[PDB]
RNA sequence: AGUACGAGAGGACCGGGAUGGACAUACCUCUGGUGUACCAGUUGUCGUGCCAACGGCAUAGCUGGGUAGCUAUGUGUGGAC
């Protein structure tokens with residue numbers, strides 16, 4: 756009938772980072788918070804945050820699996836680049852950053868592992 | 872401590888615990904073995920005059936169990952600090 760969320764409230768985002776940076780943990784926490792008033796599977800997951808629809812795609816970090824990053828950045832609108840606090844930008848962080856730049860995807864950086 | 876290291880794959884030193892193999896030793900409470908003067912079942916035959924009950928011989932006649940002792944495959948202990 757009528758779409759439950761308008762175009763102005765849609766966010767198609769991908770979580771990308773170097774290996775072990777915390778993409779899966781971040782996605783799990785995001786899903787938990789959006790679902791409270793968690794198994795991560797499938798290409799994309801749909802959730803709601805503050806009246807906004809959020810499609811999340813969690814990407815792999817290894818350079819061996821750059822296909823997933825490519826095929827996700829192709830269809831995504833925004834990206835969250837996760838950085839390990841102790842090491843900052845790492846080689847696969849650079850690789851995913853260049854892929855996002857090639858696809859012209861806006862990015863927000865998130866420094867995870869501040870407690871480490 | 873998935874820490875140091877490592878692009879990644881992977882992946883520690885040092886330290887702290889648990890639990891084994893093999894070996895040694897003591898020991899029989901347990902699990903089992905043996906257990907020829909323990910209990911019981913049973914065949915053939917000869918006896919105790921006969922019935923009943925018993926004895927001899929047949930590998931301890933054979934068979935099912937089995938005390939102590941002696942025992943391992945069983946139970947403790949050791950090579951720690």
Ligand SMILES: CC(=O)O[C@H]1C[C@@]2(C)[C@@H](C[C@@H](O)[C@H]3[C@@]4(C)CC[C@@H](O)[C@@H](C)[C@@H]4CC[C@@]32C)/C1=C(\CCC=C1CCCC1)C(=O)O
Pocket residue numbers: 813814815816820822823
């Ligand atoms: C985000 C996510 O879920 O990544 C998953 C999904 C993932 C990207 C996977 C790695 C790999 O198997 C991938 C390939 C390319 C494998 C070949 C084909 O089967 C294709 C169709 C297949 C597509 C995707 C797939 C299944 C993931 C992954 C990495 C696993 C980590 C390892 C560390 C050493 C051992 C491996 C992860 O957990 O990050």
Ligand SMILES: Nc1nc2c(ncn2[C@@H]2O[C@H](COP(=O)(O)OP(=O)(O)O)[C@@H](O)[C@H]2O)c(=O)[nH]1
Pocket residue numbers: 772773774775776777778779780781816867868869870871
């Ligand atoms: N100390 C700490 N560990 C984290 C944090 N986020 C994730 N981790 C852990 O670091 C590892 C990161 O792996 P994962 O989240 O799967 O990351 P991915 O490789 O980017 O998908 C896992 O062992 C997590 O438990 C964080 O903020 N702090």
Ligand SMILES: [Mg+2]
Pocket residue numbers: 778779814815
């Ligand atoms: Mg992951």
Ligand SMILES: [Mg+2]
Pocket residue numbers: 899
């Ligand atoms: Mg004994």
Ligand SMILES: [Mg+2]
Pocket residue numbers: none
């Ligand atoms: Mg005894």
Ligand SMILES: [Mg+2]
Pocket residue numbers: 917927
């Ligand atoms: Mg005679």
Ligand SMILES: [Mg+2]
Pocket residue numbers: none
């Ligand atoms: Mg008679």
Ligand SMILES: [Mg+2]
Pocket residue numbers: none
């Ligand atoms: Mg004779």
